[PDB]
């Protein structure tokens, strides 16, 4: 099911980077995640934690700095559902991350960590990954 | 007939703007183009001219400033096919525009004109335009 999928970013990501994720939410999915991490260690700091929760019908955005999670932000409802495919874009700007779902602007997450700290993209949880691409 | 499509950019563009163009090349197409223009008058500067040419089997990149073109850049082959649909992403970064065709980055066009000058997207030529979206 391609999970957990990891994409190393040796030179980081610059403003104007597009992370395109396509996949299927399987019929009994609880939640999956897309993490922009600062290192490969267990529990690495996270510039972005993108967490669709099918079981609670929420989409959580958060960061992790010096080992402690920030305050969660929530998007406007769950634009995913079990047994349906999806296309997500996570777009890095100078100001934050834009989440696009189903070709529609979904949520904007202001930067909390420096963007230059990102070195790894991880995708895992209850998702059957079609493709992960980084432009 | 066959008038160029125009979309204005109210807030202009900056690092992180993504221009998503989906369409189809007509079966007897010669060429089509996507322009990032700096104004609404005829002949205004083009920060980016993206010009797939089916008749000469190439894709030409260029810029226009005060009526005169610049140095032409070309990409590896032509990832377009007469009669076939396509998806193009033009991604504004800090050092240039990233052009994605299909599922892969095709060319990097380093900025020649200031990014803050772009105010209009124009698409013309032999192309069926299905959707233009700015994220």
Swiss-Prot record, chains A, B:
Expression induction or repression: By p53/TP53.
Pfam families from the entry?
Gal-bind_lectin
Q: State a single Gene Ontology molecular function.
A: carbohydrate binding
Name any GO cellular component annotation: cytoplasm
InterPro entries the record matches: ConA-like_dom_sf (IPR013320), Galectin-like (IPR044156), Galectin_CRD (IPR001079)
Indicate the segments annotated as coiled coil, or none if absent: none
> For a beta-D-galactoside, which residues are the binding ones?
69-75
Domain named Galectin is located at: 5-135
Keyword DNA-binding: yes or no?
no
Q: Which GO terms describe its biological process?
A: apoptotic process; heterophilic cell-cell adhesion via plasma membrane cell adhesion molecules
Function (record text):
Could be involved in cell-cell and/or cell-matrix interactions necessary for normal growth control. Pro-apoptotic protein that functions intracellularly upstream of JNK activation and cytochrome c release.
Q: Assembly state and interactors?
A: Monomer.
The name of this protein is Galectin-7
Instruction: Please state the gene responsible for encoding this protein.
Output: LGALS7
